[model samples]
Target: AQCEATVESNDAMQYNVKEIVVDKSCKQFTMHLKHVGKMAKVAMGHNLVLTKDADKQAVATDGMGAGLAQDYVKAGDTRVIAHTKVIGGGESDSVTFDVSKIAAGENYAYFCSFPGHWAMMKGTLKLGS
Candidate 1:
């Protein structure tokens, strides 16, 4: 199975995919996030933030305080499994994380932590064959 996946984001604060699979055979997985719309980061920025499902809202809240220079994620936040840098129009960012970080039956969530983006740009991730 492929160890890499690509996701698309637009100015409407949406990610094209709602779910991602991390194959258990791969030691690591990579996510490529692309901003397909012609909007700036401050307006319609996109990022990929990974965390436990229960930690999603809290992570987003903390990220909002961290601000954009920090890619909307708190510095050295252990709760974040992995995250991509904030991207603007036609820009892209990628994040690679160890598959071992995820366990079966554990609820995981991925979202864009760009301030208000989380409300609309979010998804679920799971470990699979």
Candidate 2:
């Protein structure tokens, strides 16, 4: 997709896409997350979160404290560029954000903010020329 992407997650704490490049021509980029496993969210939850690589750790840390009721992301946190709601098996969620916020050649990271999932279910997203 030109301005959109689909990322799939499973019960194994894995993401189908490890890295993404958002085309520069797009004013906004949308990401759709799909869970292909059979486990419930409480046991194998997942969500997509985007932030600077520098902000990854802090964002995940705060998101844990925020808990599932808040989609595992802190409310109104400036560090978060975009995020989707936590979902379970066979479920889906989507999120879109302004492309202007992405800087060319800068480091950006995308990960599942479902508590411990961030450790393994993480990747990088970059602005493509």
Candidate 3:
């Protein structure tokens, strides 16, 4: 079912899990992002942004310009299905969205848009039966 879960991101700009499968039976989905590192946000912040696989680069570029106060995600970004606020060491954030927004068979990507972390801190999100 569309459920809630926690994913950990560390100072190395890596997520503990590289993939997430959202059961398609529920209507809502939530993800908790935890920054389990010691670095400050200015140096190693983390966030979870959901978008199409092909839109990853474009989203990240716009997010960079959006800055930290905006969670590094562009304001009113229609391409983003869901996203969490930027968090540093010992910080955590969450995001909840309608499950219907994610279409099965479409490529979806989740990543941290922390300036340069998007390259390595990304994963695939799939809708599962």
Candidate 4:
């Protein structure tokens, strides 16, 4: 159970949880994104993208032009630890990545790569005991 976490994105452009503790016992971690808001177009689609806190801004900036077709992420971006697909309201998506990608004491950031949504839809993520 500790290997996975569920994050709910709402119309408010906020993730229900702010901190994700990835269990160190797991070889891979999974993030489940659920949109509880109604209407995908109106509220806009949301996605989950993970990267180093330092890379968060640049990644989001580049993703701004990546477009919805590419899930708002740069193509083959090396900074991306992992990312989930863009999902609309009432929809859900998930992405799993190897824990080896994480390093000790590194502060990670998870956010919606949707243009202009990062300010409010971002959260902290880390490997935990």
Candidate 5:
């Protein structure tokens, strides 16, 4: 089965929604991140990154040093389950990952890794029956 969803980002350093639910029956899940604000990527870029809830801060911190060219995510970071490229206003990016990576009852976090944005642009992702 095919399953996917979209999340919106804006210049206010915010996401339009707070949570995402993934159906366990789907073999793969795709997340589309759309930049709806009119800001330049250098100043207000956004990207969606998925990882364990416990690894959120550490991953964001390390990603900060990786810079925008790397989509604010560390290269080859095993802690990251999936992510999309940084996008500016009116642009969009998507990421698809195996649904099996998610385990029921585990806490998963999804957020933007653009420097200080993570504090405000974050949400919970979960597997649903």
Candidate 6:
């Protein structure tokens, strides 16, 4: 069974899709993020971060302080379910997480933590029926 998904980002600070559905049958799920623009990582980088909806803002807020060296995510942040390394235009990154970490009827959030990008590059993710 397919257990992976792909998402695209661009220089406009937007993600191609706003929602992701994970198949319950998969023990692990992979998320691939592709940056389809021409900007550099220092200027307009993007990454995929997964967390509970309630923890999204807080995690992002703290991540801003973590800096690019840490991939814009706090080091050892338990609140982050999974995250991909920040990538620039024409680059890509991927991450895999255990499906058991997600619960039914809960709201999961996926976003980019590149400085001010989160506000615009955010989306919802959930387990499939």
lDDT of each: 0.92, 0.94, 0.91, 0.91, 0.95, 0.95
TM-score of each: 0.97, 0.98, 0.96, 0.96, 0.97, 0.98
Lowest summed-lDDT stretch of 10 residues in model 3?
Answer: 1-10
Instruction: Show where candidate 6 strays beyond 4 Å.
Output: none
Any runs in candidate 1 off by more than 4 Å, and if so which?
none
Question: Which residue pairs clash within candidate 4?
Answer: none
Candidate 4 per-residue lDDT, tens place, 1-129, comes to 679999999988899999999888999989999999996743488999999999998999999888888999999999999999889988999999999999878899999999899988999999878
lDDT of 6 by residue, 6-125 (tens): 999999999999999998898999999999999999999999999999999899999999999999999999999999999999999889999999998899999999999999999999
lDDT head-to-head 1 vs 2, winner: 2
lDDT of 1 by residue, 1-129 (tens): 389999999988888999888887899899999999998988888899999999999999999999899999999999999999999999998899989899998889999999887888899999877
Backbone steric clashes in candidate 6, count: 0
Please say which candidate is ahead in TM-score: 4 or 5: 5
Q: Which of 1 and 5 is ahead in lDDT?
A: 5
Model 2 per-residue lDDT tens digits across residues 1-129: 889999999988999999898998999999999999999998899999999999998999999999889999999999999999999999999998999999999999999888899889999999976
Per-residue accuracy of model 5 over 1-129 as CA lDDT, tens digit each: 359989999989999989899987888999999999999999999999999999999999999999889999999999999999999999998899998999999999999999899999999999997
Write one digit per residue (lDDT tens) for candidate 3, span 26-127: 689899899999999988989999999999999999999999999999999999999998888999998998999998988899999989999999999988
Candidate 6, pairs of clashing residues: none
Model 5 regions lying over 4 Å from their true place: none
